[PDB]
């Protein structure tokens, strides 16, 4: 009713998000989409101060912000890949000057926060120059560069890439256009390959132990083929990591993880419910 928010999300994605994810695409495939959620309310009511005439979200109240909005966000039932939600919150006219405070109680410069493995939320306050007019709703054309800087920094922090730790008496180069330096991508790929190989090894060991312990698990030819592919891929990935080829090692580890997960989580493994062993005499005695 009081805000008419228009954002050039298409141009922002084309100019910043897509080049960033093209740089970051060595770790996998990325899907980008946007939505405008009307009447989406933060759970906690901001606290008011009579002095600064602005409303605040205390640090202890931050964890409860992202739970109510997730219901409106949904479930994304189309795909099962991990989802990273980056919300841009425009405060209502009731608490228009909304500011997030840190532990020390000072306002956050970026006015945003991020949650591990979930995403980030940025509070977008609107300038009073737009409010100078008494007519409502006022047109809000958000600034995409300022929002996207925070969102891409949060993406980097979420994906494990942190601030480079300079050795003593060292000078690091300026940021690139994409925002990611290539050697950081190499570290991320090393970590991804190692984690994928460890996950595949654990999955295969658990599958073998499950087969040993439980004797009513059905192993189909497809499951056997996937297990063989996973074992071959794990051995190849270990060999290439020993050799030094990170791209081939990463591809082999990805294939190993995919094959091991397909083999272990096949619905065909669970075929029939348990038949009691203390009731088979009623099945075999009467005729045989």
């Amino acid at each position: 009713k009081s805000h008419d928010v228009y954002w050039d999300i298409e141009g922002a994605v084309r100019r910043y998000v897509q080049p960033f994810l093209n740089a970051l695409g060595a770790a996998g495939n990325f899907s980008v989409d946007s939505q405008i959620l009307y009447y989406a309310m933060l759970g906690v009511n901001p606290r008011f101060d009579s002095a600064s005439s602005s409303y605040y979200l205390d640090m202890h109240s931050l964890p409860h912000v992202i739970n109510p909005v997730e219901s409106r966000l949904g479930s994304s039932a189309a795909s099962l890949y991990p989802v990273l939600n980056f919300l841009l919150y425009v405060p209502e006219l009731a608490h228009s000057p909304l500011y997030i405070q840190d532990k020390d109680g000072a306002p956050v410069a970026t006015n945003a926060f991020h949650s591990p493995r979930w995403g980030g939320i940025m509070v977008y306050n609107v300038d009073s120059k737009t409010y100078n007019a008494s007519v409502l709703p006022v047109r809000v054309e958000v600034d995409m560069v300022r929002v996207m800087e925070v969102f891409l920094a949060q993406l980097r922090l979420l994906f494990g890439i942190a601030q480079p730790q300079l050795p003593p008496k060292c000078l690091l180069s300026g940021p690139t256009s994409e925002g990611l330096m290539t050697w950081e991508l190499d570290r991320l790929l090393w970590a991804r390959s190692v984690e994928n190989l460890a996950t595949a090894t654990t999955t295969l060991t658990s599958l073998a132990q499950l087969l040993g312990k439980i004797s009513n698990i059905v192993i189909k030819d497809d499951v056997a083929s996937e297990v063989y592919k996973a074992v071959a891929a794990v051995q190849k990935s270990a060999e290439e990591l020993a050799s030094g080829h990170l791209a081939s090692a990463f591809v082999a580890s990805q294939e190993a993880v995919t094959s091991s997960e397909l083999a272990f989580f096949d619905p065909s493994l669970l075929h029939l419910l348990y038949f009691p062993d203390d009731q088979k005499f009623a099945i075999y005695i009467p005729l045989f």
Partner: protein
Amino acid sequence: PPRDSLREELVITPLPSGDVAATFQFRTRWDSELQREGVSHYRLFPKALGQLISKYSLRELHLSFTQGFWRTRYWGPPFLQAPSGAELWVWFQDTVTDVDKSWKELSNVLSGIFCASLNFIDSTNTVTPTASFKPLGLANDTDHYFLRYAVLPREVVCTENLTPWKKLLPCSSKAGLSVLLKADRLFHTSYHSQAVHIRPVCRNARCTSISWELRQTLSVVFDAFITGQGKKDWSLFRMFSRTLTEPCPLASESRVYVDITTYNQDNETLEVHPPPTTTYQDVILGTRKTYAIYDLLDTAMINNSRNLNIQLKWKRPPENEAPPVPFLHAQRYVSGYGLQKGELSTLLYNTHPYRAFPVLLLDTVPWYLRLYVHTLTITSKGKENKPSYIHYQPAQDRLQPHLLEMLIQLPANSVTKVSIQFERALLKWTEYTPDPNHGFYVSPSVLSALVPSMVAAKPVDWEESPLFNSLFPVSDGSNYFVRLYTEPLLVNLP
């Protein structure tokens, strides 16, 4: 210039039996190429439903969750009718290859979206109509190889299904007519249907371009004895436990239509306590109907200083003033007794005094009710009737249901009986439902017809007409299309 717009409306029609029926519609039209991958920025149009069109090659998607059965004879023709339980019929694009695989994937995704057990849609439920369920939007060609229709008659609809449905609207029950959707009041009804319709429509009057429309509808019928309890006075507050306060800011049109036509009185109208913004008359469902419009976007009607509570005075009309029975209605039942054999008999009533019109009967019977097509008899006025077009596919045990489509010509002022014999089948002890003595539901039959109209209807503009008048394409001025669904049938197996 935004490329999408939202129109919402609520039509309140008093029924001939003294009940009051209210139908919500929230139409969102988008001028985007959702059929091709790349549309990733959603406003108004829900993202949850937008990505389906591109992910699975879709042309038209129709989903309905319904409680109760529309009593056509006593309630009059409906704007929109749906079978009991879940109903999902979809139209895949010609570019698709594995229609059944996309059907299964889409059914599971829709189950996840709407919190309904739509994963039970299998080959045993799915049918491919040959002449029924034509596309409801713009269609270059009609190849039924790309059509799938499934119905789950035992599916229930509750708040668990209404909340995802309400969360797909832009206002999301915070403003507009969506605030009237109270779960307690909506299910305290004789009829309740939640529908989601996706189809392509003309972008402009020239209709040279494709625009995508989403129509979310909710139809309820309030009983005169349960809700009224002898009050004999209707109101928005008395119906929804809530009064309208503000229109949806996103909507470019939010109006309330109240039917005020008196069929017996000489040009008189029903009484509405607040004066309507305007009065609109047009040929809806074959009869000249007068509507009172409450434009919620007008400050002179509703604003921040007052709420809107539309009060309508309606009681069951006397026998003399009762409207004539609709020209087409049907009932379905099971003939015989025991647990060995029976008959699925359908009665098709043509009440028109002198006009005979064709009808299209669609029957889908599960595999355990083995049908004998040589026993199919269609007797109208006591003599054999030969259907113009008959298509029958036999069921395969645990793999296919029976499908039987007929194009029957109903003679004027007659009742046509369509009966086919079946033998109940004994299943394995693990193939029964947890309640095996309750019975098995036979899916409701679908009746498509072009019912003649009392007066001729002028060509209508879908962008300048009420949303209840643009549900079905109109081809002839003197005929309108109705899709009746009969009652579900409960049969017991040995």
